[PDB]
Structures are given as C-alpha cells and as structure tokens.
A and B are shown apart, each in its own frame.
Chain A
C-alpha cells in the first residue's frame, strides 16, 4: 500500500534555509507518477499549498511564495525534497489515482520560525 512519512529539522532561525524530505513506501515513483506536493497549515489556521514535483526535473510553485521555494527529487533513494530561502505544520500528499485530485496524505512534523 502507499505510505508517506517525514523527517527534518524542527527549529529554524529566520531567513535561514529549511530542508524537508518526504519518504515513500510505495515504494517507487516511475513514469507512472502523477503529482507529489507540499501542503502547510499554521495551527489554528487553514491549509496552504506550497510546491509540487514530478519524476522529471520540472515542477510547479505558488507565486505566493514568490518562488522562494525550490524542490528537489532523488529517485535513487525514493525521496523528494524542498528548499526555502511563515511558521506552520507541514504535510506531503500526492496523486495516486486517475480522477480524484489530492489523495493519500503523510504526516509531516512541525517546524517553527
């Protein structure tokens, strides 16, 4: 079955770079991929969409982040990451299904600026 966990730092000083990596126990990405993005939510607030990447280098960002974001993918170790140059709880959800939209979610730990 699909499976998404998350690791990474949990204390970031302002203006400094954050790295978040999401591991999948699918366990593969393939040309059979669809989308894998990031979703953040400030506790007590609503949900916010971050970035999104395919198994190709191409990716789609939200200009709300003014492209401060920059995501990476390593199919070798079956993971995709993210680089940022505002404090919230994070997530990695995907597309694993024609039709639908965003399905299959992975708890993404909390980080504070």
Chain B
C-alpha cells in the first residue's frame, strides 16, 4: 500500500488524502481509516468505506474507485492533528499504508 507521509491545511480547509494499492487489495474489498494520536492506539475512523462509526463527525469522508481510495477531512481544525492510516483485506490478509501526519 501507498501513502504520502504528510499533508497540510489552514483551520477550515477541505484537506484530502489518497490511498494507493493494487487490484489485489482496495479493488474488491473494504477500506478502513484510523486516527492514531501519537502515543496512543488507533481508533477506527471510517469502516467499510464511507461509513462513520459512532463519534466520528460528518467532517471526515470516504471515497473509493479503482485501486485507490480517499479521505476528505473538511472543516479541518486543531485536534484533528494525528496519524491517519488506511487499509483493507488483500486476498489473504490485512495490510496498512504508510501513514500521514496531518498538520494544521
């Protein structure tokens, strides 16, 4: 899997992140995203694509097509500074992308 190690935005910008893998993975399954504050364990943020667990506001977003996904954190604010990881099931097991430090 593939992720660009950083991203940027001023408080109130619709910041986005891509998520690149092969057709073995993201093509025929479900994407999950995780907001890991540094020094803690990751919280699921988006499950089975677009769907948001209880707690995660509408600000975070989901999107998938081909062998690459996306995560649109609109209305970006301060506490949203963390480590976002995407990942699904390849044909045999579970994988993660690189990771991304959101900085506001």
Q: Classify A-B as touching or not with yes or no (CB < 8 A).
A: yes
Binding site for B on A (CB under 8 A): 37, 46-49, 52, 60-62, 91, 93, 99-103, 105-107
B93 touching A62, Cβ below 8 Å: yes
Interface size class of B (residues with CB under 8 A): 20 to 34
CA A60 to CA B48, docked complex, whole Å: 21
B96 touching A48, Cβ below 8 Å: yes
In terms of DSSP, what is the predominant structure of the interface of chain A?
Answer: strand
Residues of B within 8 A of A91 (CB): 41
B44 touching A103, Cβ below 8 Å: yes
In terms of DSSP, what is the predominant structure of the interface of chain B?
Answer: loop
B32 touching A99, Cβ below 8 Å: no
B48 touching A105, Cβ below 8 Å: no
Binding site for A on B (CB under 8 A): 3, 30, 32, 34, 41-42, 44, 47-48, 51, 53, 85, 87-89, 92-99
B47 touching A105, Cβ below 8 Å: no
CA A52 to CA B44, docked complex, whole Å: 18
B32 touching A100, Cβ below 8 Å: yes
Closest-CB distance, A57 to chain B (whole angstroms): 17
